[PDB]
């Protein structure tokens, strides 16, 4: 239970929560905007995963201001969570290499 692994776990949990809330809130923001496609929850959940991973195929996206604000929160949550996982991996590798050198 080192700090970086704990923060990775917390980040994963928070990211899942952000995906669920982002899905629900994107549907709430986008309904009422003619032409909007991000308007049912299953595909909104798929879109939130797309957005958080940055693997944005372009099949779905928000057209409203509040839908795009929701999108930005999902983007930042995903990108920073994955950066935090990378940082935790770096810390683990650094510690293990320090032990391997006997420092």
């Amino acid at each position, epitope marked *: 239970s080192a700090l970086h692994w704990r923060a990775a776990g917390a980040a994963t949990v928070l990211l899942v929560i952000v995906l669920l809330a982002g899905s*629900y809130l994107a*549907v*709430l923001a*986008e*309904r*009422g*905007a*003619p*032409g*909007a*496609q991000l*308007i*049912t*929850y*299953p595909r909104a959940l798929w879109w939130s995963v797309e957005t958080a991973t940055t693997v944005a195929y372009g099949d779905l996206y928000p057209v409203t201001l509040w839908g795009r604000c929701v999108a930005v929160v999902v983007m930042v949550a995903g990108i920073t969570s994955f950066g935090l996982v990378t940082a935790a991996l770096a810390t683990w590798f650094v510690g293990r290499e320090q032990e391997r050198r006997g420092h």
Partner: antibody, heavy 118, light 108 residues
Framework: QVQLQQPGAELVKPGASVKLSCKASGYTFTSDWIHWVKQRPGHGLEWIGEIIPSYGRANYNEKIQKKATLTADKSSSTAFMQLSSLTSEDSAVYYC???????????WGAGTTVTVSS | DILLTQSPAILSVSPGERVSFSCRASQSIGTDIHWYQQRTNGSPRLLIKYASESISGIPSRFSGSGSGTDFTLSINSVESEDIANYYCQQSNRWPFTFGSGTKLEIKR
């Protein structure tokens, strides 16, 4: 059990208003949307609007003259549609329908026949 | 706003035959089309969701097909209880819209 309960009929004088109700039973989810659909005698189905009761936000058909105002009471699982200042063009059966946020109307109420007449 | 064209507006068929209702979307909408039956003085009843998915309690004579702009509701072996108006409805873009309906008639 019947999932959506609507009164059978409402008589409204021209110019007056009426509040239709739709009491829901069965499974209730935060993702539930309640929709309202107008059907004039011998005509098709016309979407009026929707409301998400867990948040109270309502959206309306932009193509038609706005005569409805949608509200919901979460404590009694009942959705209301206030139709305001009616003419005979507003005489119709008004259905409510429940959509689980996945785009289709899984269940419909029996419909309230609204007659606008003196 | 997506226009759903249902034509012909009336279909006449002999008992026991296969019948197909057409629904055409003004733009491509994947499989986000749902089909409802409304009998005289009745409420609409969902028959088929997402173009081809069965609904519990609906007779297996009902099926659906198509994707993009062209969709078909089919009844294998029409019988009298199938006399009704049939409506398609799209959920691909806001607002949800309905087709204008096709009436099924049986030549007995």
């Amino acid at each position: 059990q019947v999932q959506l309960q609507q009164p059978g009929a409402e008589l409204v004088k021209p110019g007056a208003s009426v509040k239709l109700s739709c009491k829901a039973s069965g499974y209730t989810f935060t993702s539930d949307w309640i929709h309202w659909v107008k059907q004039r005698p011998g005509h098709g189905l016309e979407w009026i609007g929707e409301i998400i009761p867990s948040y109270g936000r309502a959206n309306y058909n932009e193509k038609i003259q706005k005569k409805a105002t949608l509200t919901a009471d979460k404590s009694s699982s009942t959705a209301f549609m206030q139709l305001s200042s009616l003419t005979s063009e507003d005489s119709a059966v008004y259905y409510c329908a429940r959509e689980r946020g996945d785009g289709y109307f899984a269940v419909w109420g029996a419909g309230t026949t609204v007659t606008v007449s003196s | 706003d997506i226009l759903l064209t249902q034509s012909p507006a009336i279909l006449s068929v002999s008992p026991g035959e296969r019948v197909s209702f057409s629904c055409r979307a003004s733009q491509s909408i994947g499989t986000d089309i749902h089909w409802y039956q409304q009998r005289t003085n009745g409420s609409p009843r969902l028959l088929i969701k997402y173009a081809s998915e069965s609904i519990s309690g609906i007779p297996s004579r009902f099926s659906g097909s198509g994707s993009g702009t062209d969709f078909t509701l089919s009844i294998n072996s029409v019988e009298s209880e199938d006399i009704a108006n049939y409506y398609c409805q799209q959920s691909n873009r806001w607002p949800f819209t309905f087709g204008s309906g096709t009436k099924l008639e049986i030549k007995r």
